[PDB]
Amino acid sequence: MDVFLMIRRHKTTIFTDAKESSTVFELKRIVEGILKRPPEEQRLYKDDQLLDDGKTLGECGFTSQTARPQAPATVGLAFRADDTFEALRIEPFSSPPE
Amino acid sequence: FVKPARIDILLDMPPASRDLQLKHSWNSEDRSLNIFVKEDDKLTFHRHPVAQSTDCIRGKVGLTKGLHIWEIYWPTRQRGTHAVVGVCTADAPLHSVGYQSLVGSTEQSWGWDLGRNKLYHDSKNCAGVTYPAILKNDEAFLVPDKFLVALDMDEGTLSFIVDQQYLGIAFRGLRGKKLYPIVSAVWGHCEITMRYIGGLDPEPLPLMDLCRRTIRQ
Amino acid sequence: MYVKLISSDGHEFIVKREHALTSGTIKAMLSGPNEVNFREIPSHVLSKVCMYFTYKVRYTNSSTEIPEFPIAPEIALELLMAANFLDC
């Protein structure tokens, strides 16, 4: 029933979990309580696919089997500054020594 | 033949204290009367040179949960025709008239016959199974003086480690039982030492230990 | 509720406070006699560490079979130094 995620924007990464049955809009409310930006100023993605507010996370592809605690699924986030959304930008993490 | 995660990590942790070894040692009050625990060494038992007799002794503590590993020191020249190591319930008989692989002869015990490299459990009704499984042409796998016994009461499995090499799962289906370490011997004057190595709860292991394990690979 | 853990390369990881307490070091830093900055732990290591926090809390408070915590050989050495430093 639970999905574990990383909600990411630029160099910000939020670790949190949500019910697979919960909605994209409900997740935006979670992000609002954390980053203090209203749902309308938010856009959430699964890769390059923009997520619709009324869909459940499950419907978006975030299942308990593909979003585990030890390997959370990633949800992209983009903010809007004055009726204009920034493009989705997530900075990558550093890389191992090789 | 790579040690599963929990076992590897448990074996990298400091060995159980001298006190823990004694708490999990042979039970002088739960033995065949042809065996006696050494007065000068409570971790070792001695078998009287009785002909046509198979004898066992159970450890003091019956295990019901967690991963437990103990070391058995059994001189290779003190084994003879029937040397078996394993676990059993409190009801498994500790003595038998005649020489045989007593441990694993009924549904009450599970054992690895060191000489035949055969796994026995309720052997009166179920044939023994070669172990390690890689053996061919009925060739012998010489188990050295010392080796490890790993009992996982969480997953209900029994396995052995020899020369640091995991030999695979030997038995399954042990969940929900209370099992005691045991061996059946037929060698006159043999002395078997059992040193409890350690125990591990079925909880997430610390990242530090998990990393060292990945590195040791 | 949440705390911010910052990597050497500037990534900010927002995790539940209880989860972060999995680390003895962070626990001590959050007590004293909010944020936590790390001079030598890069994002690819800190991110992995946070996943461990999620893993540890979820499976410690349960009796269901605990799955394996994935650690790629490439990061194992750095992860170890971070785990030792963070005491977890």
Residue C57: CATH number of its domain: 3.30.710.10
The answer to whether B211 contacts C49, with C-beta atoms less than 8 Å apart, is no
CB C36 within 8 A of CB C30: yes
Q: Mutation test of the interface with chain B: which of C80, C81, C84, C87, choosing the one with the most B Cβ atoms within 10 A?
A: C80
- Which helix (H) or strand (E) element contains residue C27? helix C24-31
Per-residue tokens: B2:
């790579």
CB neighbours (10 Å) of residue A95?
A: 11
Rounded (10°) CA dihedral B2, B6, B12, B13: -170
Per-residue tokens: A21: 């049955």
State whether A12 and C55 contact (CB < 8 Å).
no
Domain that holds residue B171: 1-217
Residues of A within 8 A of C68 (CB-CB) are: 70
Rounded CA-CA distance C57/C51 in Å is: 10
- What chain A holds in terms of domains, given with CATH numbers, is 1-98 (3.10.20.90)
Report the distance separating Cα A4 and Cα B204, nearest Å.
17
Range of the domain at C57: 1-88
Q: Which of A18, A3, A6, A19 is nearest to A65 (CA)?
A: A3
- The experimental technique used to determine this model is X-ray
Q: Does C77 touch chain B (CB under 8 A)?
A: yes
> Which residues of chain A are within 8 Å of residue C9 when distances are taken between CB atoms?
93-94
- DSSP-assigned letters across all residues of chain A: -EEEEEEEEBTEEEEEEEETTSBHHHHHHHHHHHH---GGGEEEEETTEEPPTTSBHHHHT--TTTSBTTBPEEEEEEEBSSS-BPPP-BPPP-----
Q: Per the structure block, which two tokens stand in for B170?
A: 């030997």
CA distance B101 to B121: 10
Distance from CA of C66 to the nearest CA of B (A): 7
The Cα–Cα gap between C7 and C11 comes to 5
Phi and psi for B109 in degrees, rounded to 5?
A: -145, 160
What is the distance in angstroms between the Cα of A85 and the nearest Cα belonging to chain C? Answer: 22
Composition of chain B by helix, strand, coil, percent to 5: 10, 40, 45
Residue A16 near residue A82, CB atoms below 8 Å: no
- Residue A68 contacts C, CB cutoff 8 Å: yes
Cα of C19 to nearest chain B Cα, Å: 14
Hey, which bits of chain C come out as E strands?
2-6, 12-16, 35-37
The kind and range of the H/E element at B21 are: helix B18-23
How many CB atoms are located within 10 Å of the residue B5 CB?
15
Instruction: Name which of B145, B185, B179 is nearest B61 in CA terms.
Output: B179
Q: Other C-beta atoms within 10 Å of C37: how many? A: 13
Resolution of the solved structure (Å): 1.8
Our count of domains for chain C comes to 1
The answer to whether residues A75 and A67 touch, using CB atoms and an 8 Å cutoff, is no
Angle among Cα B196, B199, B200 to the nearest 5 degrees reads 165
